[PDB]
Amino acid sequence: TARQRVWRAFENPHTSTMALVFYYVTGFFIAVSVIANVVETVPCGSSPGHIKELPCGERYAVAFFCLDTACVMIFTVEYLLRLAAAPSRYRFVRSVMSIIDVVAILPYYIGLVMTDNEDVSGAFVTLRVFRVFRIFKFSRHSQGLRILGYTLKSCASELGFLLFSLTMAIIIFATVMFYAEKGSSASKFTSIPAAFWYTIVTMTTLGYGDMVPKTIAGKIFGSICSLSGVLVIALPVPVIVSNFSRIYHQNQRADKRRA
């Protein structure tokens, strides 16, 4: 019956002292890993005799590797314990938290296997980027994060229509903008895919200004694009906000009922 005891500790950290210390230790090392991954890219100043300033992760590669190894070992022991204490192991493995944990730990081991290709870009940059998904292990510590996941899953059809109608509007407005603006002098609107960038920046009302229309037709269709983007993006926002509040309120009804 020790397996179910360990599982109960893992699922309910606040029931047991050992569960709670495990909870806090893992949360602390998630924060440590995230901060280290950010900090290792910061220029640490020019080293003695160095041509240029070196990133902290390059100047202290051993220290950052040791910190990464400690965090990854903690995450791996955590995941292996969760797998060991799972009632239905396959059901655990296919759960979203398990996918998050596996995505968090895999890049370290892949980078070990591909240590010869560490200098080679492409894969190195991909592993570096995938290291940032360890921040999703905070979903086990944040109830709001889990509720956000539940509401995104709940609003799947509205998010799908958001993607589809946004794609439609982007294509339409980029076509019109490209044909209105391609003849301008030194035009940034060099193709319809190039005009995708302008269209998405206009629809969200970012307005970077790196791409701006210069013709009258360009101005007219850019204005219409901004308004249409406002409408398209506003369509699913009330649904998402309402479902988030509904799930939060259901959680707090359950909490006050059982306590």
């Binding site: 210390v21 909870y23 806090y24 090392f29």
Partner: peptide
């Protein structure tokens, strides 16, 4: 619960530091 977690955190941090100093 907080105290034991803090103690474990300090132990593991010390081990990381000693590993760094060794290498």
């Amino acid at each position: 619960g907080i105290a034991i977690a803090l103690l474990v955190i300090l132990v593991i941090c010390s081990l990381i530091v000693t590993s760094v100093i060794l290498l």
